[model samples]
Target: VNSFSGYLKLTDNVYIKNADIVEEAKKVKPTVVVNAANVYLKHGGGVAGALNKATNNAMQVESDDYIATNGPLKVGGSCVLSGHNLAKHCLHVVGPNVNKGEDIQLLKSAYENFNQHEVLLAPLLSAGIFGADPIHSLRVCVDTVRTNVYLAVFDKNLYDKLVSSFLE
Candidate 1:
């Protein structure tokens, strides 16, 4: 595995890194820090948990507020709220969990529904606990990124694979 303090250029402008999203957000300072969230928009763990702690738990507050105003976010759906301290805004995306025997198309739509932004910082939606395969999730991340996203990778092995795959 390669050592990288910041990020590696996965594509033309997309960056992939094996680091905490919140910590990376602090440096990248993207317009919207994307989080992998559940349908109910709970910020209890995973990406949500970390961002919640990073934003002084304000991410949970805003997430609850969004749910109150817009109803629960459906799979493949997303919503935006103040980032509190991480970035200008926090965009929570719900992806299809493979463990639940969910469809992969839903994951595609999640990336598609990201709407538009200048610096779209995205994550590997539906991967890991959500149950999507690493290589497949990485493929989605790369494909949808064509559609500036800073792709945040949390695993060292995945980081090495991504770098080797894209770099060579």
Candidate 2:
């Protein structure tokens, strides 16, 4: 596997791994696992899908309950969810839907809105189906995180890009 031994620029504690979000979260066992969520917080695809599977599809059940009580999360908004069997806690954040013309600040805000945790395992928000630029997505996420974070990516190609950005 390709890897970067050095730390990301402007941060030393953050780590990038070429692994599934749920799988990395399991190994590192961060305080919370973050999902690149939609406004409705559904667990049907992408990071949400993996989380749903890891939690035996109960994560969505909790998400539905949360939505029932709190309503759909706003653009750039965030909420906490019960982790079921995966981890102690989960964070759901709605990133900018570029397909709908939402701006980068909204994507940046998604990171800012995360609930406080000492060590968080997070995905590269908006870089998937939402179609945000991967490097741009990474910069905003890393810049916005206030605590130590483990960034989990499913592809080694992306992992190499993110890691290489540090040297450029």
Candidate of highest lDDT: 2
Query: How close is every model to the real structure, measured as TM-score?
Result: 0.88, 0.88
The regions of model 2 sitting more than 4 angstroms off are 1-10
lDDT of 1 by residue, 42-87 (tens): 8888888988988887778777887888889788888777877777
- Name the lDDT value of residue 133 in candidate 2: 87
List of clashing residue pairs for candidate 1: none
Candidate 2's residue-wise lDDT over 98-134, tens digit each? 9778887788778886537767777888887788988
Off by over 4 Å in 1: 1-5, 165-168
lDDT of each: 0.77, 0.77
Q: Model 2: how far is 40 from its true place, Å?
A: 1.0
